Structure 1
Amino acid sequence: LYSKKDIVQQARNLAKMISETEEVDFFKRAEAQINENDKVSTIVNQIKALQKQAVNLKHYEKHEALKQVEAKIDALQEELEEIPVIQEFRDSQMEVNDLLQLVAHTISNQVTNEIIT
């Protein structure tokens, strides 16, 4: 019989064996290209400052002012979501997630079927 430490180790290797995949490898590659992109870096800092300005407009109870900045932030995020480099990232992330899900499922399903002799 095995303890939870044996099983957590066995899993930590499979996790590396999962980092050793096309999918994960693609992910890091799209991850590289988005902060390298100085249109993305522009918005993530434009909004970063706009977010900090909203903290002040919270203290300074100003309905119209805080929502002017709020409407400008939310729209700038949606506009940032239309950049193809982040569009690639969002997909690769999902593809990685699916493999992790599939792996996790194949495991629980073997266990849940085989458990009762």
Structure 2
Amino acid sequence: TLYSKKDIVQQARNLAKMISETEEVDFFKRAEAQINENDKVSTIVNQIKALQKQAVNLKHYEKHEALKQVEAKIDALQEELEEIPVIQEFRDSQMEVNDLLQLVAHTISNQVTNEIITSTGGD
């Protein structure tokens, strides 16, 4: 009997659980732990939050010129955030995990095509 879509979904979840037990995701997890504890990241994320609250207010009241300044402040803070060591580590771990996922997707896609070819021969 053929695998049902339901079987495949369960098997895909099993693959994901193993993917979550790779050095890549292990890196992402400890990196994430470090940015949740870093004080500088906390200070900056809060300031950004506060400014985004003002932004919504300024646009409501159509304070365009004032909005531009708040937006400049947010851009300034976001770039500062990315300069932070633990943030750089986090971004690096994110990429490692996203690249791994893409590899899995390509592998699955390419293997399916191979299996279909070996079974049919292509059209």
**Residues 42-53 of structure 1: pairs in structure 2 closer than 5 A:** 42-53=43-54
Kindly provide the CA deviation profile for residues 29-77 of structure 1, in whole angstroms up to 9, marking residues without a partner as x.
0000002001010010011001101111112222221111111111110
Kindly provide the CA deviation profile for residues 68-110 of structure 1, in whole angstroms up to 9, marking residues without a partner as x.
1111111110111111101000011101111111112111101
CA RMSD of aligned residues (A): 1.0
Q: Share of identical aligned residues, percent?
A: 100
Aligned to 2:36: 35
Structure 1 stretches lacking a partner, 5+ long = none
SS class of match (1:39): helix
After TM superposition, the structure 1 stretch with the greater mean CA deviation from structure 2, 59-68 or 15-24, is 59-68
Aligned length: 116
1-structure distance, mates of 2:60, 2:11: 51
2-structure distance, mates of 1:93, 1:59: 35
1-structure distance, mates of 2:68, 2:85: 28
Q: What is the CA distance between 1:113 and its match in structure 2?
A: 2.1
2-structure distance, mates of 1:26, 1:99: 12
Q: Give the TM-score normalised by structure 1.
A: 0.94
